[PDB]
C-alpha cells in the first residue's frame, strides 16, 4: 500500500543546510506529483513547491524560491527538499506529499521531518471549539476570491497523521466515514461532522486547489470534553 516515509529530524545551526528526503513504497513517484508543505508556528501550513519526478520539473512559491530547492530519484523513489542557510525561520515540520492532480488535492502524507534550527487567501472559523460525543460540530472557511469549488479538507491528528478527508467541496476520500460532510460554493465553504465520536480530536483544515500556488488555511482545533 501507498507509503511515504520521511527522514528523521535535523538538528542544526544557523546557516547550515539541510537535505530532507522521502521514500515511497507501495507506488512510483514516477506516477504522481511529490509536493513538500511547511508546518511553522508561525504561518501554519505553507505549500513550499513540487516536483513532477517523470521530467524533474518544478513549481515553486516564490516565497520560498531562494530558500527551498526539491529534486527526486526515480530509481530509488524517493523526493527531496533542500533548504538552505537555515535561520530560525525556517525551524518546522516538513511534509512530503503526492498529489497526482498536482495541487489539486494531497491524497497522501508523510508524517512529517521535524527541523530545529538552534495569491488566494483562505480563512477558517471557528479556530477552536470543544464539542461532545455524538454532538454536531460545523466549521467554516472564506476564500479571498472565488475557487469554484475546489476547496478540500484535511484531518491533522495529534500525533502528526495527516489526512484528506473530503475533496472538491464534498467528495468524501477513500474510508472516510458518512458522519463527515462538505458544503458551499464560491468563496465560503463549511465542513460538518454530525455524530462526533471519540477519535475526530484533530486539527482540520481547509486548502484551495485552483489557484497557483495552493494555499492553506490556518486550521481549525477540535477538542472533545
Known amino acids: 500500500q501507498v507509503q511515504l516515509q520521511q527522514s528523521g529530524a535535523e538538528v542544526v545551526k544557523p546557516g547550515a543546510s539541510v537535505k530532507l528526503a522521502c521514500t515511497a513504497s507501495?507506488?512510483?513517484?514516477?506516477?504522481?506529483?511529490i509536493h513538500w508543505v511547511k508546518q511553522g508556528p508561525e504561518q501554519g501550513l505553507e505549500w513550499i513547491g513540487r516536483?513532477?519526478?517523470?521530467?524533474?520539473?518544478?513549481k515553486y512559491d516564490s516565497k520560498f524560491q531562494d530558500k527551498a530547492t526539491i529534486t527526486a530519484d526515480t530509481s530509488s523513489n524517493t523526493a527531496y527538499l533542500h533548504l538552505s542557510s537555515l535561520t530560525s525561520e525556517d525551524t518546522a515540520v516538513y511534509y512530503c506529499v503526492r498529489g497526482d492532480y498536482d495541487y489539486v488535492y494531497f491524497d497522501y502524507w508523510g508524517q512529517g521531518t521535524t527541523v530545529t534550527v538552534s495569491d488566494i487567501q483562505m480563512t477558517q472559523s471557528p479556530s477552536s471549539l470543544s464539542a461532545s460525543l455524538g454532538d454536531r460540530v460545523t466549521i467554516s472557511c472564506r476564500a479571498s476570491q472565488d475557487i469554484s469549488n475546489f476547496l478540500d479538507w484535511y484531518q491533522q491528528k495529534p500525533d502528526g497523521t495527516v489526512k484528506l478527508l473530503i475533496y472538491y467541496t464534498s467528495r468524501l476520500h477513500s474510508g472516510v466515514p458518512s458522519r463527515f460532510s462538505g458544503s458551499g460554493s464560491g468563496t465560503d465553504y463549511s465542513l460538518t461532522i454530525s455524530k462526533l465520536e471519540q477519535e475526530d480530536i484533530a486539527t482540520y483544515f481547509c486548502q484551495q486547489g485552483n489557484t497557483f500556488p495552493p494555499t492553506f488555511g490556518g486550521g481549525t482545533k477540535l477538542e472533545i470534553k
Open positions: 516536483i513532477d519526478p517523470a521530467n524533474g520539473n518544478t
Open positions: 507501495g507506488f512510483n513517484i514516477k506516477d504522481t506529483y
